[PDB]
Amino acid sequence: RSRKESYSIYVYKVLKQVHPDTGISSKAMGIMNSFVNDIFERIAGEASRLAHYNKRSTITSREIQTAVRLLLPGELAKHAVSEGTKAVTKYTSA
Amino acid sequence: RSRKESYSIYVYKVLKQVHPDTGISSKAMGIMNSFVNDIFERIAGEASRLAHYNKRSTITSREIQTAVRLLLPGELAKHAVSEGTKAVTKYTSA
Amino acid sequence: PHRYRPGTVALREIRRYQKSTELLIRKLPFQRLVREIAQDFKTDLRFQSSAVMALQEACEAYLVGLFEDTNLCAIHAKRVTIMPKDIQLARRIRGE
Amino acid sequence: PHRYRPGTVALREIRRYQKSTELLIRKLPFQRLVREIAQDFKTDLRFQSSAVMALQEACEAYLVGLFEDTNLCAIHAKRVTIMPKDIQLARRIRGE
Amino acid sequence: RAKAKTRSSRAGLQFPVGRVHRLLRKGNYSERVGAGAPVYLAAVLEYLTAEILELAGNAARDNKKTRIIPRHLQLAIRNDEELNKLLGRVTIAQGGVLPNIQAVLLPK
Amino acid sequence: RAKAKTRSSRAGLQFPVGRVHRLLRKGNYSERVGAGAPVYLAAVLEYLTAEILELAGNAARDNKKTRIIPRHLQLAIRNDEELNKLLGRVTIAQGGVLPNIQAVLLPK
Amino acid sequence: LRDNIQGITKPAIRRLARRGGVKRISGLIYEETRGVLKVFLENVIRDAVTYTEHAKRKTVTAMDVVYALKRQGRTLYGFGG
Amino acid sequence: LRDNIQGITKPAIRRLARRGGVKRISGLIYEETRGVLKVFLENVIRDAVTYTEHAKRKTVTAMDVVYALKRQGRTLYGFGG
DNA sequence: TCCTGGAGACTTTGTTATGCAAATCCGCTCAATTGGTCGTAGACAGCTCTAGCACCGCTTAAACGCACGTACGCGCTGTCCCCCGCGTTTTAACCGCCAAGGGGATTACTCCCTAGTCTCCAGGCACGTGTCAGATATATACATCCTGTGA
DNA sequence: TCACAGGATGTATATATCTGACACGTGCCTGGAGACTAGGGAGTAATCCCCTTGGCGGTTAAAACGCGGGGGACAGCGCGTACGTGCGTTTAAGCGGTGCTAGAGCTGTCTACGACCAATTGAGCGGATTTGCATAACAAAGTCTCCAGGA
């Protein structure tokens, strides 16, 4: 039989970090999967164009960072940037 | 020296085949260039996704044809489809 | 005898329906409307049960949002009752 | 003496401004506004002359469309004079 | 050796084909581009291009001109219901607006 | 021979990194994807995910449940204007609406 | 079949209006509302069918509807996509 | 730079309104109009500057403005695109 | 005038037992990681040159500000008829059930269509040169609209 | 009330003029086109079996209908002021220069960077049990309307 990919595992985990005693319906999960896919596409889409306009072949953390700012509200953008900045900084050191 | 590409040559000719006695200002030409690029990107963008949705790598005359309909109003769409059909039918037949 | 006056009940219905999530429309009538329209583009079409549900929710969401704007237009004209023209104004403002 | 009546002049102005294509907002005032805003984000920022014009045309197009919708809102309320309310209503209907 | 020619000639088109093939290929629109894809699209762009220019030329003559300017393009687009959709949100430099005066504002 | 190890662990993330890297490679976004690219992105998606779920969990609590349902997501999102905007065009299946009644309609 | 536009009954229209915060409805709304609904459906269905035909299929799926809705400036969550 | 928002003078506001078909303007419009203009302009500038920074430059070009406008459903023709 | 207070109806709070949707466990691939290589986009330094910034002086169109009068916006009143709320009656929608087979999803082969390659040359580009449609200033003639007398 | 005159006003039409923005010409260089191979993507046929369509009977809310009466929609009228018109007086925006240089744009070189391949294997998937949350039923307690008189 064929196999599928989704984010239901990771969404479940995150819920625990914020609310360790809270579960989630399959429908709410269906919503969360659409959410993640939507945001992913937007960032990847915008980042693609930044590379296009600046004549680059490679998407780096920068195009993503810039794309994030153009897509997110200022407050969310800041927290998102801080987390991304670290993930990359650390990954490099790790 | 560096170089550029535009559609100013082709736009000019098309006018002549319609109104042989008229010309085009530099701005009207600049506008027509933005117009061509805009429509081009939409069709190419949508055609890309149709292939993606249907798990395919190659864009053919059909992904474009479908994209044309989704993007154009029904009246323009069919005229465009007729012309597209011929250009390809002929090309492959010649 | 006992009863409520006009305006009292209407407010309650607003409260309740805003609160709930389910469909406010009937299903079999809707399914058929979808098909009656669909056949105009192509005969012998079929639908998945999830396809129809997706259409219903999109339709209700659309109309509910429209009614909010319609209601505001009526208020702007110092009214409570909504008229067809209040709908038309809102739509046109939105470029429809 | 001789005079034109209230509203008669305004109509001629409406026609002319709809008809002509030149910018209505003065250039230097506009350019300065662009920078006055931009500096709040970044100092030592510069603009090409074509960039400033691009901004200006977009700005006028936006306000002109806004005013048309504003005008309709006032008409819907049986008025000729536009008020801040009519601006706000039109925008809100568009989810701004 | 066969003599080389442009594909736009073969397809009976005025718009370039080899270039479109390339443009579709790049910008990462797809991994691959079929042989008939660029041809189909060039024809589509050509059709739409002709319609705008034709209408604008008439708009130019309404002003007794022998030349098309941005304004004429504006009028062509707006008077045509379909173009006013496809390009419904396009802002055109120095386009101006249609002479739309609401009846209720007229004197009486 | 080192033991194979998930990149997500290195970055301290819960979301997958290697998969994101792949998704970035395809979808025809670019020819190439940088090493830190999927890492940065995974962190962002995870962050936003947490914000919705946290508010949703609070909304669920307010309705005295131990579980999140689509409705709680709806209310949680709107109660945060930053997300209301990001998702200002998203229809939530069974989201319902906010209980807003205009003051002018109230009895008095 | 036929006449399923009348299938959108009055009470249904009222209830939809109520979520919108509408308290009071004139007698002419019902017909205007139906015309509006129909246009919405025609546009969404037509696009969904187009996707279905492209894929050379007969049954319209949730994804066909979701894609059709999306591009009209409206993204639907929970049905996949 | 300060108070160049007042640089958008009454006549300018009037004329823009006139092009929109507005005949008659209340005295409170002028202040409201400026607020709305500003938000529109500011948002566009911000996106354009963001693009400028990404490109690591100081001078904003027309294309940065075009992209800034575009994504808001504002395709602009005549300045390149 | 308005304020009980009471009668009434409707929503919320607290029990209670039950069903199935969600949480967790088990076993099986195949996508993620390791660990090498290869070729090249991206970073950098450097230099040339264009376009933006700053300043100056002068003309004058456009922006201020004032004063007079008027259509407009607003509040208030008074009919009247359209929409609400209620009870009685009829209709069609759900729910659970069962049967048939059409079409969606799957694998397994085949080839032919397209990526990728070298070589060649002419179509499109930048940059000059020539011209004539459109812009300027001006006079001229034609519509239109405001206020006045006189029916 | 109503039309018409005409007076002033503003807009449209014809002419001459001239200038700079277009149309067209020349020479030059990549980029598009022949002619070529090699290899996986897409097309085809064959198969399974999941899901939709269709029909049935019975139960029950949910729509239809009609009645009666009050609330809001609408039209008309009066008040006063907030705007519009037009004059005279300030002001600062264009216009056409001038000169400086900071930064954009292109060249040339060298490097670490990500793509690619092949081998190995554990994270994630589907599917099978488990059990506790949410559901529905039921009775009581609390909250919110709407009169009928009275202080």
Taking an 8 Å cut-off on Cβ atoms, the answer to whether B22 and E57 are in contact is yes
Angle between helices C49-76 and C28-38 (to 10 degrees): 100
Residue pair E95/B53 in contact by the 8 Å Cβ criterion: no
Tell which strand I nucleotides have any atom below 7 Å from a protein Cβ: 8-11, 21-23, 30-35, 41-42, 51-53, 62-64, 69-74, 82-86, 92-94, 103-107, 113-115, 121-127, 133-134, 145-147
Which residue is nearest to the C1' sugar atom of I8, using CA? C2
- Is residue C29's beta carbon less than 7 angstroms from any atom in nucleic acid strand I? yes
Domain that holds residue G36: 1-81
Q: d(Cα E30, Cα F80) in Å, to the nearest integer?
A: 38
If you measure CA to CA, which chain B residue comes closest to H63? B34
Smallest CA-to-CA distance from H45 within D38, A72, D60, A49 is with: D38
Which amino acid residue lies closest to nucleotide I22, measuring CA to C1'?
A25
d(CA D71, CA C57): 34
Residue C32: exposed, middle, or buried by beta-carbon count in 10 A (0-12, 13-18, 19+)? middle
Q: Are D32 and H36 in contact (CB under 8 A)?
A: no
**H27/chain A closest Cα distance in angstroms:** 34
CATH of the domain at E41: 1.10.20.10
Q: How far apart are CA H34 and CA H15, in angstroms?
A: 14
| Nucleotides in J strand less than 7 A from protein CB | 8-11, 21-23, 30-35, 41-43, 51-53, 62-64, 69-74, 82-86, 92-94, 103-107, 113-115, 120-127, 133-134, 145-147
Give counts: helices (H), strands (E), chain A. Answer: 4, 2
Residue F17 CB in 7 A reach of strand I: yes
Residue F52, number of CB atoms within 10 A of its CB: 26
What lies within 8 Å, CB to CB, of D93 at 6+ separation is: C69, C72, C73, C90, C93, C94
Total domains in the fold of chain G: 1
Which of D86, D89, D91, D92 should be substituted to probe chain C, the one whose Cβ sees the most C Cβ atoms within 10 Å?
A: D89
Handedness of CA F86, F89, F90, F96 (dihedral sign): positive
Q: State the Cα–Cα distance between residues H10 and H4, nearest whole angstrom.
A: 13
| Residue E76: CB atoms within 10 Å | 22
User: What class, spelled out in words, does domain A1-94 have in CATH?
Assistant: mainly alpha
Round to whole Å and give the CA distance between E45 and B43: 10
To one decimal, the resolution in angstroms is 3.5
Q: Which residues contact F36 (CB under 8 A, 6 or more apart)?
A: A60, A61, A88, A91, A92
Closest-CA distance, C3 to chain G, in angstroms, reads: 19
The pair of three-digit structure tokens given for residue H74, joined into one six-digit string: 């504002």
- What does the alpha-carbon distance between residue E29 and residue E39 come to, in Å, rounded to a whole number? 16
Chains F and H touch (3+ CB pairs under 8 A): no
Cβ burial, residue C3 (10 Å; 0-12/13-18/19+) = exposed
Is residue H70 within 8 angstroms of chain B, CB to CB? no
Contact residues, chain B, for F27 at CB < 8 Å:
52
Half-sphere exposure of E71 (CA within 13 A, CB side): 17
User: Is F94 in Cβ contact with C22 (below 8 Å)?
Assistant: yes
Residue of E13, B65, G38, F67 whose CA lies nearest to C40 = G38
The tokens of G18 are what? Answer: 């109520």
Nearest to B33 by CA among B61, B19, B14, B18: B14
Q: Do H62 and H79 meet the contact criterion of CB atoms below 8 Å apart? A: yes
Cβ burial F82-101 (10 Å sphere, 16+ → b, else e): bbeebbeebbbbbbbbeeee
The answer to whether the Cα torsion of C52, C53, C57, C63 is positive or negative is: positive
Give the CA D9 to C1' I150 distance in Å.
30
- Whichever domain contains G78, its CATH number is 1.10.20.10
Each domain of chain A, given as residue ranges in start order, spans 1-94
Could you list the residue range(s) of the whole structural domain that residue E24 is in?
1-108
CB pairs under 8 A between A and H: 18
G50, G63, G71 ranked by CB distance to B69: nearest = G50
Those of residues 19-78 in E touching chain B at CB distance below 8 A are: 19-20, 23-24, 27, 29-37, 39-54, 56-57, 60, 65-70, 72-73
Task: Count how many domains chain E has.
Answer: 1
What phi and psi, each to the nearest 5 degrees, are found at residue C14?
-60, -45
